[PDB]
Amino acid sequence: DKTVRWCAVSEHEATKCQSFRDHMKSVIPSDGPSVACVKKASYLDCIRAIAANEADAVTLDAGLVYDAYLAPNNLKPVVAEFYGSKEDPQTFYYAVAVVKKDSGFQMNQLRGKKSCHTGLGRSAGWNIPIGLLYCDLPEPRKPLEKAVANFFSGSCAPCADGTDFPQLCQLCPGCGCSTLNQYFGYSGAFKCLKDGAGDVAFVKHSTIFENLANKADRDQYELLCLDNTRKPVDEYKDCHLAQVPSQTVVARSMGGKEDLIWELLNQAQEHFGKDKSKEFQLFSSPHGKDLLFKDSAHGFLKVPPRMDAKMYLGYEYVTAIRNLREGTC
C-alpha cells in the first residue's frame, strides 16, 4: 500500500518515528502500509516539505493546521486525534492557564508576569490566551509578538523570532521550535512553570496530570478562570479559557495519499494504540512526550472527504484566529 513519508521534528521524534516504522514492518505484511521518516528542525519545514512533495504527513496543533492551509501550502486535515476515551471520544480539548498556588494574581493581573507558551501560533499556548488578553496589551499592538513581549516581563514562546522579539525567549533562549528546547510544547511550557522561570503556563487540561502523578504535588498548582478567580487543576471544565479542535494530521490536496495515511494510522492504532502493545506505543514514548502525536490522544478518526481546514476547525475557532490577527479595541 505504498509508503507514507512522515515528518519528524528533531531527534526525539526521529527516534520514535524510526521505532514506528520498524515495529510496523514487524507486524504488517509486505501488502500493508509502511512508514518512512523525514527529519526537520521545525514544523514549518514539515509543512514546506509536504507541499513540495518531499514528505507526506505531519500532525499539527489546530492553530498550525489553520496556518498550513494558507497559500502557498494549502494543506488539508486528513486524520484527527481524539481524546478522553475510546468509549466517549473527544475531538476537542480545554485550554487552561496553570499557575502555582499562592502566587497572588488573577487573569486581569497578568501584566508584568512571566509566561510560558507551548509555541507561537498554537491553540492553548498562544491563540486562545493572547486572543483573550489582546486589548490588555499596550499599543501599538502590532506586531502582536512585540506587544505580547512588552505586556509580560519575560516569556518563552517557542518558534518566535528571538532576534526581533528578544523578550519572548527570555525564559527559553533561542525560542527553539522543537523538543530540543526543553520548554517547548505542553510539558515544556509546564516545566518552564515548575522550574520557576515563569508565573503561568498556557497549556491543556491534561498537562499537569501528565507531569505530576501524585495529587499532593498537583495541589500546589491552580488554574486561572475567566471570572478572575482561581480553581483546582481538577476543575478545568469550569475554569478554562476555551475549547479547541484536536490536533490533526495534514497532507497535500493533490496526490496527498490521504487514503494511505488513514490506512496506516488506523492499523497502527490497533497494533500500537493505547494499551495495545508491549513493544511499541503510538501515544507515549521513552524518548519524550507528545512525539509525533500527543500522549493524551486515545486514537484516530478519519476527516470527512475533501474537507478543508476552515470547515474542519469550525467557524468559532476560525473566527477566534481571525479576530486575534485582526480585531480592534
**Which residues are at the interface with K ion (CB under 5 A)?**
150
Q: How far is the CB of 112 from K ion (least distance, A)?
A: 8
Q: Which three three-digit cell numbers place residue 231?
A: 480553581
Q: How far is the CB of 246 from Fe ion (least distance, A)?
A: 8
Closer to K ion by Cβ: residue 150 or 277:
150
Q: Out of K ion, Fe ion, none, which partner does residue 61 contact, by CB within 5 to 8 A per kind?
A: Fe ion
Q: Which three three-digit cell numbers place residue 307?
A: 474537507
Q: Out of K ion, Fe ion, none, which partner does residue 266 contact, by CB within 5 to 8 A per kind?
A: none
Binding site for Fe ion (CB under 5 A): 61, 123
Q: Out of Fe ion, K ion, none, which partner does residue 18 contact, by CB within 5 to 8 A per kind?
A: none
Distance CA 138, CA 135 (A): 8
CA distances from 126 to 36, 64, 83, 91, 183 (A): 31, 11, 21, 19, 14
Query: For 140, phi and psi rounded to 5 degrees?
Result: -75, 135
Q: Out of Fe ion, K ion, none, which partner does residue 150 contact, by CB within 5 to 8 A per kind?
A: K ion
Distance CA 137, CA 327 (A): 13
Closest-CB residue for Fe ion? 61
Closer to Fe ion by Cβ: residue 126 or 151:
126
Closer to K ion by Cβ: residue 59 or 167:
167
Q: How far is the CB of 138 from K ion (least distance, A)?
A: 9
Strands annotated E in 85-198: 89-90, 92-100, 115-117, 155-156
Closer to K ion by Cβ: residue 150 or 267:
150
Q: How far is the CB of 150 from K ion (least distance, A)?
A: 5
Distance of CA 326 to the CA centre of its chain: 23
Closest CA to 249 of 40, 75, 19: 75
Run of H or E residues at 4? strand 3-9
Q: How far is the CB of 280 from Fe ion (least distance, A)?
A: 24
Q: Out of Fe ion, K ion, none, which partner does residue 210 contact, by CB within 5 to 8 A per kind?
A: none
